[PDB]
């Protein structure tokens, strides 16, 4: 007989060398079995690329998320310092106009 891995990686031509002692229906069923194992791999490969794309999108999102949160936090912390400096700056200009 033949295993699942041996059959799925077998080319069509190479499968023609493993027909010793098989009926016409046994050959058709063996090819149909190879097609089924092929479909099992197509489905698994289709799901690998979908998981790959999703995890890659969620990786960029998490990286940009912590990037944006740090930017928003540092911008707010610095805006406070700029408002305090500008507030003291305008008080000096106001005091200078008194002179």
């Amino acid at each position: 007989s033949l295993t699942d891995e041996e059959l799925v990686t077998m080319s069509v031509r190479e499968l023609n060398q493993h027909l010793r002692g098989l009926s016409k229906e046994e050959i058709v069923q063996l090819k149909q079995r190879r097609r089924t194992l092929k479909n099992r791999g197509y489905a698994a490969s289709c799901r690998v690329k979908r998981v790959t794309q999703k995890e890659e999108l969620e990786k960029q999102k998490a990286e940009l998320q912590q990037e944006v949160e740090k930017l928003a936090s540092e911008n707010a912390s610095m805006k406070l310092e700029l408002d305090a400096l500008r507030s003291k700056y305008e008080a000096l200009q106001t005091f200078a106009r008194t002179v």
Binding site: K54, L57, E58, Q60, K61, L64, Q65, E67, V68, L71
Partner: peptide, 12 residues
Amino acid sequence: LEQDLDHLKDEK
């Protein structure tokens, strides 16, 4: 997710 990436790039 692609909408999230689009907005995050605009927010950044």
